[PDB]
């Protein structure tokens, strides 16, 4: 009877570590699980992560968009690259953050398979620059110069993009 | 049925080890947990720690200021450079210490992400020098010369700053 287990009860998940295929499978399962108990109860997802890879991040995003309930997101502390692309992929009015939290946007590290798949990596990281552009409200040609550089943005200034829309 | 678990019961937490992201998540959860049982019961937090890092320390402080109950703090033994701050962030009249305990104030070690984020580290460690100045009662220009040097201060002399206000 662990503490995280009790947080799985009443509909919370804690992505806290990192992302790879080992944790991806274990999160996809919990999402599908909690959907089965009730089809309208708001599930949530807390984030505090230092990174993530490309192939697994685009498994949780799809599952998030399929289950009939609606997901909410919060940023506890760090919001590395990629794992924080999930934060901008919840609901249109239920994205939060604490007022000392850092979030950055940057294209992730590593490859797809995790020889080198060139034509496919280059396509995958074009989708990110296009999905992020429909959830914030910006043009595309500005995201293409903020998904190539590195600088942490605070919580009060992240609001002007659209990654977050209410700071508690 | 462990002994710490029984101390989680009747509202105590034991930060005793160190601070990093692994323990941060596990403390934020317990804080949110105990709030759910009762919204007015005084929770406490015992400290005995040799250090801590910057990004995670400013996650517990925010959570501490959000839950409607009020937190109390005690210094068992050592009070490192980052732990100390949490001790000076409880209530205005419920900060204690034992009469052999040492506490020091010093800006922490390491970086933010845990390349190097220069513009952000330098901003974060300005907040510390400003929050500590509203909880003790001193000017700012004295804290800026005590958050740059290293010397342990005893429990009887720490009182004259405001980190502690009643010694048992």
């Amino acid at each position: 009877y662990d503490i995280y287990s009790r947080l799985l009860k009443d509909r919370i998940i804690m992505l806290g570590s990192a992302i790879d295929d080992n944790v991806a499978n274990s999160i996809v399962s919990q999402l599908l699980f909690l959907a089965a108990e009730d089809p309208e109860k708001e599930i949530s997802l807390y984030i505090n992560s230092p990174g993530g890879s490309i192939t697994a991040g685009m498994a949780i995003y799809d599952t998030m968009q399929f289950i009939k309930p609606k997901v909410s997101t919060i940023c506890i502390g760090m919001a590395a690259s990629m794992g924080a692309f999930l934060l901008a992929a919840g609901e249109k009015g239920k994205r939060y953050a604490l007022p000392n939290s850092e979030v950055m946007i940057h294209q992730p590290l590593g490859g797809a398979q995790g020889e080198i798949a060139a034509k496919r990596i280059l396509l995958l990281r074009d989708k990110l620059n296009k999905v992020l552009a429909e959830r914030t409200g910006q043009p595309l040609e500005v995201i293409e110069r903020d998904t190539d550089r590195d600088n942490f943005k605070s919580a009060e200034e992240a609001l002007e993009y659209g990654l977050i829309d209410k700071i508690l | 049925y462990d002994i710490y678990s029984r101390l989680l019961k009747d509202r105590i937490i034991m930060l005793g080890s160190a601070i990093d992201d692994n323990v941060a998540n596990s403390i934020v959860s317990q804080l949110l947990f105990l709030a759910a049982e009762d919204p007015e019961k005084e929770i406490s937090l015992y400290i005995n720690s040799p250090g801590g890092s910057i990004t995670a320390g400013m996650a517990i402080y925010d959570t501490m200021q959000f839950i409607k109950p009020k937190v109390s703090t005690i210094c068992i033994g050592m009070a490192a450079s980052m732990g100390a701050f949490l001790l000076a962030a409880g209530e205005k009249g419920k900060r204690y210490a034992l009469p052999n305990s040492e506490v020091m104030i010093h800006q922490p070690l390491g970086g933010a992400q845990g390349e190097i984020a220069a513009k952000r580290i330098l901003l974060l460690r300005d907040k510390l020098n400003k929050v500590l100045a509203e909880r003790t009662g001193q000017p700012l220009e004295v804290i800026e010369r005590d958050t740059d040097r290293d010397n342990f201060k005893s429990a009887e002399e720490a009182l004259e700053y405001g980190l502690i206000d009643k010694i048992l």
């Binding site: 509909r11 708001e42 949530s44 909410s72 919060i74 239920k94 939060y96 | 949110l32 959000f66």
Partner: peptide, 6 residues
Amino acid sequence: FSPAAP
């Protein structure tokens, strides 16, 4: 973190 997420 309620009121209001939950």
